[PDB]
């Protein structure tokens with residue numbers, strides 16, 4: 001019940017993908033003004049998560065492999081509202097490197113953004129293959145934000161993620177912000193929202209949060225510091241098992257970076273079979289490491 005074998009883009013190797021990395025990274029640098037100077041890093045790692053998070057372990061439908069976000073049904077998923085911005089960013093890159101598959105580009109965009117925003121290295125594998133429009137999953141596989149801990153735990157079981165993987169993933173460097181017109185929630189999780197940090201965990205623990213209603217008539221937790229947490233975020237300190245992992249990552253930056261790197265790669269790779277003869281995962285160099 002549904003197999004997807006990774007097939008390396010013909011004749012490509014590490015250096016080819018580093019070149020795509022760099023063009024993405026260079027474009028991140030250049031289009032700095034987007035979203036009141038947040039830049040496109042956060043929306044790129046949200047795009048990578050949403051294209052991967054449609055996966056279902058039961059029948060291997062959804063997932064990053066087929067690059068199906070390029071079809072209207074998924075592009076138009078209300079859950080993906082705002083991600084068009086990320087797709088538009090990547091269009092010039094796809095045009096310069098037409099040989100890369102859509103799944104590989106969406107997922108490599110997420111890796112690139114995380115690394116350029118000073119996050120951990122994320123090992124990445126190529127070989128996703130575009131699949132037809134009829135393989136696009138239905139809307140409704142991404143998680144709601146108005147729910148509690150039990151919802152979150154059950155939701156992520158479908159993505160084969162456990163408690164520790166779920167808390168590392170959500171804490172997601174503390175990046176970008178909620179926008180009322182996209183999601184019915186408004187504001188950032190922290191102060192350094194285009195730098196990958198463990199500040200989400202710190203803020204959850206140390207801020208003084210009040211449950212308020214936003215202009216869209218949705219509840220969210222708000223802080224005097226100007227920060228916000230989704231009901232689902234806040235549930236990570238309401239559930240005692242989540243809570244001890246929140247404290248752990250708030251008190252160990254390196255541990256969080258390593259756990260996140262593992263789970264993000266895992267997330268991006270769910271549903272994909274890699275041949276024994278596949279190339280090993282690539283670790284890309286940042287622009288800064290290349291002196292670029």
Ligand code: HEM
Nearest residue numbers: 042043046049082144145169170172176177178179182183
């Ligand atoms: C229970 C799971 C989660 C829920 C309910 C969810 C929900 C949300 C919501 C409502 C937004 C705001 C969208 C908008 O208004 O622009 C948001 C932002 C985003 N999400 Fe999540 N999220 C979850 C998991 C994740 C995880 C696992 C990642 C990736 C590792 C992630 C990365 C992001 C990013 C980076 C943003 C900011 C995008 C922007 O600034 O443009 N989310 N998400």
